[PDB]
Design a binder for these strands. Structure first.
Lengths: 282, 282, 282, 282
DNA sequence: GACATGAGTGCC
DNA sequence: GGCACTCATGTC
DNA sequence: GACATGAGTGCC
DNA sequence: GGCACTCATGTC
């Protein structure tokens, strides 16, 4: 019903692929041609369906009756999740060769910073499939079920996770430290201490995030990349990244990435999705 | 170009009247049939125009060329400024006779919490008109002039106001502590310490805000009401509110306001704009 | 055995009486001519007996073998307890008529700041006698018994009280809050966070003490007076003191108390022990 | 002429020699048959003299008239400086071989924790004779001279070094950071943050000290050793200690030293003063 | 007596 | 109006 | 020696 | 991965 446009090229096959690998059962549904999930904005709840019209390079968004009163906010959330503001020319031009194998590459955002915070923490260590399944168990235990869509469940809110029992979370298959990380993050979101929108100084912001128990450099970087969709951040600590730069230390890698500023977040995505890639031995 | 729905009744005459008295020259233009202002979403800039359509219960939004990449976020900003989410039947059902005279009353929000915080601060102990002109000076002195629309300036970024000279601001017409208050707020906005969207615990978030220099209970409440669009906050320390409640002390007003929960913000507006209103002598 | 001097006059009956009223069963023993009690100095423990000799203004101190290795710390603890340093000519000269009825009055200190801290906390709200009853109970359950002197038990150390169960202390006859205050104090004691000797800036240190849970202004002052032997502190919040200044508010008593600077601690004691004292008819 | 006991053996020659090299001109006077120094306790001041009596295993202490009022505290200060509490049969029965050559070794204490902290700071990275000459300058500029004994001067008090101009301190022969260290230290001493007596948890307290500006691990360890007279601390970061354990890392040194628990401080003193000492093949 | 809350009174 | 700073209340 | 930075190790 | 702790290293 609602439509949002984008600037070609846009690789929808990759975006949905990325998102489908990380989909949380009962929360999200990802198909080759559309994306849909439960969505909550305040006390308004429902389901959102996004259908990409390649031909006319536009995204069709349908909203369940419950979200109509806050239609625009839902639209802004989809635009952030799908990085519709991206001008591929500027990025593909500034990255030269690195972004030529797939110039439609977009930065997968999120629909809610808190959710992404929870996802980022649970993403620690385990594989993607495990992170997803782990997140699914948290949603099934603390999420809100939609009365008009019994198959859908809303992602847990800060009010529920903040009151959660550390041992209950532990029981879902996570260390006690990670459960406490979640409970503390929820409390921050309630208090208004978790930046829900990109701050002017992403560097200071992340430094403050690292004071949170259970959140280190990796988590804060990954949270900034996906949760604030900050476009200039690298993850020299990432497992797959450390494999793309054999023999180099976090600082050497970090020093190498300076060359891609101010679009380091994009460079990161490309290097991640190019198995053959390797650095230039200066 | 873009259109947003709203549920009747909606008193546009009153809404535009409220924004018009507080309009900042060079930043926004308010007329009988429309509202327009500069808008910055990251590096994207332009002018937004809002034209209500009573016949269709719709609001038409026009974005200048520079804001199209982030059109959805702009739509969301406008929906928060004009309280398009409001269901008057629900609010009026609860408020009873209090709102019966103007069932179309809405809660005027803002397009950005930082800006609103700056405005809430410059409005301390001065007339709406002075605060208006005062803010304009700060605007011209630190704003980003739109190239495509020379007469429009974007509101100062936390960036620019954080590195401002506490004196260059006092000069414009404010005590020294007033200027420090702004400079502090700006820094907070830079690292994400100022909540940009409403937190789960409004009570607690306001407490933290009150630890800010230059921000007391009044400013913090007014900020929650307009900047976060919190719907259940009252302003017992407001000068005018004290006149509407002859005699009574803050805790007594607050106690009497309890009867309008969970829509105290709306009740507040109805009382502010109802001349001879007075509590039940009961 | 060991002997220490003091300067006449010294009202030993008033002093011994004062200590008898607060004496804790199993820890101390007070008679009309001597004071004796358990005493721990690190890992060294034993019994100390103090016998005054009015004729030659000397105090004879005896130590059981367990304390011999730390003789001098024992002597210092005893001299602070009995305020052997006092020069009555100076203090009585400054107070004037206030202290002319008992020129031999001294400031009863303590043998250990941690102990006094526990004693001050348990002295909250209740009567002198009842507090001694409670302290005796706490010591009974958490103190160590001297092998060499079964009849005696050492006052509970900080490490023992720190690892005590709040519920176990609650049962002895105090609210849960009060018992938590004790456990917190023990922790500060272990960490070196509770000044054990009088600080250079008593006012500042007392302020720091008030941040402790369970410790308000009364407990901090009283503790500073007994635990540090601060000579210039008044107790305007004291029960009996307010009874000596009928109808006067805290800040009033405090301002009045100023004329006794810098010996307010001594004036305080003189007022407590003047049956019919009343502020000057002026 | 007061008298204190000690258990034999006691190497006075070694003790006086250690204090003699660190003697600060005008404050302490060291000779082979006696130690003498100015001393303060609150506002009572004077000169203390200590005469060892090998014959009767006794130490004779004489106090000038200005200290008599607080004689007991003065005796405790001396017993801590000279480690009179030490039972050599117990320490050596544990250290074995290592302590067999100088069974009379004692732990040189201090007369006051603040003073010792200052010396720990001014002894950093400079020779011993140099720290002595520098400290003497500070004592000379910030000390209260004694009226009864013109030749002697009191060590600086915390209130005085606190109101010190950094620049003034530096000019005496030290970097700025250091002078700043002394000033912070005085403040802490003033508000009661610097533990003046050994705490229940020496390790926790040493960590809290490491957060003071200018105090690292070597300074904390050393301060604890001499300022609190902690009997079980080792200094794996010491210049000479690194030389005694050739090619060993601080962690390896520390692991090795565990064989001397719980008397690591005495082990440290024996190893420090044993030229050519070296570790076994453990 | 500790501690959070309410009054208010006066000052940049 | 922010900010402090001093009484007066009312549970545990 | 204090103290930032940076690799690296070992245990949640 | 987080995080406390360890081993250089360069600076003042």
């Amino acid at each position: 019903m609602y439509t949002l446009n984008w600037q070609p090229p846009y690789d929808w096959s990759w975006m949905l692929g990325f998102l489908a690998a990380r989909a949380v059962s009962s929360v999200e549904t990802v198909a080759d041609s559309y994306y849909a999930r439960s969505l909550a904005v305040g006390e308004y709840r429902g389901v959102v369906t996004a259908i990409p019209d390649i031909a006319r390079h536009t995204l069709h968004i349908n909203l369940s009756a419950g979200l109509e009163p806050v239609a625009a906010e839902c639209l802004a959330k989809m635009s952030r999740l799908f990085d519709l503001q991206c001008n591929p020319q500027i990025v593909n031009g500034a990255l030269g060769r690195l972004g030529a194998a797939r110039p439609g590459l977009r930065l997968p955002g999120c629909v809610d910073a808190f959710e992404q915070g929870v996802r980022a923490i649970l993403g620690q260590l385990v594989s993607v499939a495990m992170a997803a399944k782990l997140t699914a168990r948290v949603a099934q235990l603390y999420g809100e079920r939609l009365d008009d869509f019994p198959e859908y469940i809303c992602f847990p809110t800060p009010q529920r996770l903040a009151a959660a029992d550390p041992q209950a979370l532990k029981a879902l298959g996570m260390p006690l430290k990670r459960a406490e990380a979640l409970i503390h993050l929820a409390n921050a979101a309630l208090e208004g201490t978790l930046p829900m929108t990109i701050p002017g100084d992403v560097e200071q912001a992340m430094k403050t995030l690292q004071t949170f128990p259970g959140i280190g450099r990796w988590t804060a970087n990954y949270f900034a990349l996906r949760g604030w969709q900050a476009k200039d951040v690298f993850l020299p600590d990432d497992y797959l990244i450390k494999q793309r730069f054999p023999g180099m230390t976090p600082a050497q890698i970090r020093r190498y990435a300076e060359r891609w500023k101010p679009w380091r977040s994009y460079a990161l995505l490309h290097i991640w999705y190019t198995e053959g890639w390797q650095p230039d031995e200066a």
